[PDB]
Amino acid sequence: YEHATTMPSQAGISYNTIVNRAGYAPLPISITPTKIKLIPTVNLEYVTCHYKTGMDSPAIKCCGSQECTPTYRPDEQCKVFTGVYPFMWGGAYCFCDTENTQVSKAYVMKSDDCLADHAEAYKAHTASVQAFLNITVGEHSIVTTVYVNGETPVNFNGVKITAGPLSTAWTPFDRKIVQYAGEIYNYDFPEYGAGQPGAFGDIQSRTVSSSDLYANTNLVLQRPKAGAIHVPYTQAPSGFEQWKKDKAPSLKFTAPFGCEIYTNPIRAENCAVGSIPLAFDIPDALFTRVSETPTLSAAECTLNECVYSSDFGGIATVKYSASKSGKCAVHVPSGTATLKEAAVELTEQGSATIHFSTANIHPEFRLQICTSYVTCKGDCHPPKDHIVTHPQYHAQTFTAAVSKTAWTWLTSLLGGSAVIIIIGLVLATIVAMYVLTNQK
Amino acid sequence: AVRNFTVTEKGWEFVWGNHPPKRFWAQETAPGNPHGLPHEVITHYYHRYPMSTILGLSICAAIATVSVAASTWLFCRSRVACLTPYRLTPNARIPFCLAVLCCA
Numbered sequence: 001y002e003h004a005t006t007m008p009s010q011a012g013i014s015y016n017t018i019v020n021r022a023g024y025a026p027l028p029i030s031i032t033p034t035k036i037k038l039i040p041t042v043n044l045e046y047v048t049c050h051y052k053t054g055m056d057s058p059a060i061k062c063c064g065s066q067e068c069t070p071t072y073r074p075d076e077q078c079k080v081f082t083g084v085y086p087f088m089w090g091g092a093y094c095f096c097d098t099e100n101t102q103v104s105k106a107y108v109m110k111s112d113d114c115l116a117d118h119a120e121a122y123k124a125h126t127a128s129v130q131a132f133l134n135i136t137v138g139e140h141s142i143v144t145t146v147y148v149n150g151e152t153p154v155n156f157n158g159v160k161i162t163a164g165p166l167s168t169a170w171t172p173f174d175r176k177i178v179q180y181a182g183e184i185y186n187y188d189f190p191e192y193g194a195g196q197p198g199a200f201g202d203i204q205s206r207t208v209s210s211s212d213l214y215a216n217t218n219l220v221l222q223r224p225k226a227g228a229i230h231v232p233y234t235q236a237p238s239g240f241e242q243w244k245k246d247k248a249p250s251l252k253f254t255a256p257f258g259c260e261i262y263t264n265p266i267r268a269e270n271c272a273v274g275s276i277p278l279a280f281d282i283p284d285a286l287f288t289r290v291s292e293t294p295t296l297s298a299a300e301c302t303l304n305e306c307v308y309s310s311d312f313g314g315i316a317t318v319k320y321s322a323s324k325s326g327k328c329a330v331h332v333p334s335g336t337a338t339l340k341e342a343a344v345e346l347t348e349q350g351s352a353t354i355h356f357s358t359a360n361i362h363p364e365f366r367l368q369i370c371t372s373y374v375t376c377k378g379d380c381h382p383p384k385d386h387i388v389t390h391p392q393y394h395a396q397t398f399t400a401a402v403s404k405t406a407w408t409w410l411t412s413l414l415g416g417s418a419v420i421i422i423i424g425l426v427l428a429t430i431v432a433m434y435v436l437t438n439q440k
Numbered sequence: 441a442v443r444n445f446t447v448t449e450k451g452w453e454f455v456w457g458n459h460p461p462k463r464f465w466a467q468e469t470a471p472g473n474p475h476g477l478p479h480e481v482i483t484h485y486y487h488r489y490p491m492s493t494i495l496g497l498s499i500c501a502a503i504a505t506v507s508v509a510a511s512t513w514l515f516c517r518s519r520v521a522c523l524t525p526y527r528l529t530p531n532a533r534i535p536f537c538l539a540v541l542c543c544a
């Protein structure tokens with residue numbers, strides 16, 4: 001047997017369905033997504049951390065001149081300052097008052113803590129979806145991590161399930177993302193080799209252990225103070241630390257649809273968007289003929305309690321006179337109510353209670369049991385809580401909460417005016433016919 | 441501080457300091473009573489479903505007013521068309537219509 005159903009991708013909410021055949025007992029299928037993941041494929045563009053300005057010891061030449069060694073290091077700069085008179089703790093270093101030179105040389109390296117305190121700039125694309133479903137079909141229950149691509153089935157007890165593809169291609173991560181301290185930021189970082197001073201990525205390394213380093217920090221060399229041995233320099237402040245000052249909240253705080261962002265691997269969990277289409281291939285072994293299953297008779301539904309709350313705020317009691325004990329795949333074909341139980345135990349004679357959740361102020365649905373179709377009606381009342389901590393299990397119809405007094409008033413306004421128009425038209429036609437027939 | 445936020449049926453969460461995030465969902469509860477007088481019904485179906493009552497109520501009122509005006513217009517036209525043949529007779533004898541319908 002083949003089925004094609006579709007269930008909302010709302011984690012933590014069970015979803016029940018029934019399968020019917022011409023000469024087979026109905027069977028219940030319950031799917032519970034405990035966790036829905038979205039794992040984009042990410043490429044490590046580069047790694048950024050705090051830099052460290054390293055200066056070579058000044059090359060002091062007394063009564064002479066020096067030349068600039070050519071540049072070979074990240075952001076490396078060299079300059080020869082003439083007319084210096086350095087001092088040390090012993091005393092004056094040179095004996096010439098002038099024509100002394102000092103070579104100052106600076107460059108940029110990664111900080112010693114780049115192995116731990118670093119941010120990884122990634123390119124994110126090609127999202128993939130996985131779902132951890134508790135699946136119960138034919139009183140057979142399993143747990144499976146099914147991929148939500150439409151290509152890969154999952155098999156168990158001869159049953160085949162093909163999930164996906166996901167209805168919506170939406171993803172929280174954009175093309176360029178930044179991972180730092182276990183948090184993901186949607187940041188438009190500069191490309192490798194295109195970093196700018198004082199901003200994120202001012203120094204870039206391909207890998208945390210890589211031997212390359214692009215540095216752009218506006219390093220310049222100043223003249224040493226008179227009678228001093230040091231290498232003055234001026235730099236734009238670190239772009240990593242400035243970025244940390246102005247990160248803005250991470251994706252776990254700014255993502256839509258309630259997504260929860262995790263790292264290692266970079267993923268988004270429990271996004272309440274889209275719907276998973278399921279394709280079922282069920283072997284005929286699980287199916288049972290109508291004779292084998294109990295057949296229901298003399299069943300009446302009473303709504304002894306109903307509040308149209310988000311949770312199962314309704315109880316329906318059905319009086320039944322069944323042929324034999326067994327199991328019924330209790331289900332409501334309409335969207336009026338959502339049933340907590342996908343199956344109910346059945347005895348020879350008695351009453352069965354079913355917990356249901358509805359958004360209708362005046363509910364009236366066709367509860368389906370093993371074979372019977374009971375018509376169940378009642379009245380519901382507003383619940384206590386203004387706010388709850390769980391999503392609504394039912395679904396809101398356009399005419400869900402419309403009462404009956406509203407129907408009476410609307411029919412009187414829309415339906416009484418039509419009556420008045422009909423009366424006027426009849427009177428006009430009668431008068432016209434009367435005068436026309438009374439001319440001759 | 442006191443901060444008010446609007447929570448709808450879709451959901452709403454807040455993180456306060458180092459506490460774990462807390463999520464809340466609205467729920468159709470109040471105010472008014474749909475099983476009551478018209479003002480209570482209008483209040484209940486306005487606070488809930490806003491802009492779907494103001495539009496609907498205005499549409500219904502406009503339809504009712506147009507229907508009433510049209511019915512009055514047709515009734516007056518019928519009265520004129522049934523009386524003027526009898527009305528403009530020089531001696532103005534109008535027993536039959538007034539006896540069968542009491543139009544005047």
Ligand SMILES: *[C@@H]1O[C@H](CO)[C@@H](O)[C@H](O)[C@H]1NC(C)=O
Nearest residue numbers: 012014032034133134142143
């Ligand atoms: C899904 O199955 C697992 C494994 O037994 C269980 O721990 C979990 O509670 C089940 N989920 C629900 C919603 O029952």
